[PDB]
């Protein structure tokens, strides 16, 4: 890993869906 | 309070912070 401007992550307990932080 | 238009919930693994769905 070199770049990671993203803090945490959270998945959506539904129709195979998710979202980034 | 009375209503709940939010299906699921996700907490933020950081400085005592969270968010609603």
CA-atom Rg of chain A in angstroms? 11
Q: Which single residue is written with the structure tokens 């609603």?
A: B20
For residue B10, the tally of other CB atoms under 10 A from its CB is 17
**Cα-to-chain-centroid distance, residue A16:** 13
Q: Closest chain A residue to B19 measured between Cα atoms?
A: A10
Q: Which single residue is written with the structure tokens 């959506």?
A: A12
Separation CA A20–CA A9 (nearest Å): 5
B12 with A8: CB under 8 angstroms?
Answer: yes
Q: Which single residue is written with the structure tokens 């693994």?
A: B13
List chain B residues with CB under 8 Å of A21. Answer: 12
**Cα-to-chain-centroid distance, residue A17:** 10
Deposited experimental method: NMR
B8 with A14: CB under 8 angstroms?
Answer: yes
- By residue count, chain B amounts to 21
């Amino acid at each position: 890993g070199s770049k990671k401007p993203v803090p945490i992550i959270y998945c959506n307990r539904r129709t195979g869906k998710c979202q980034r932080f």
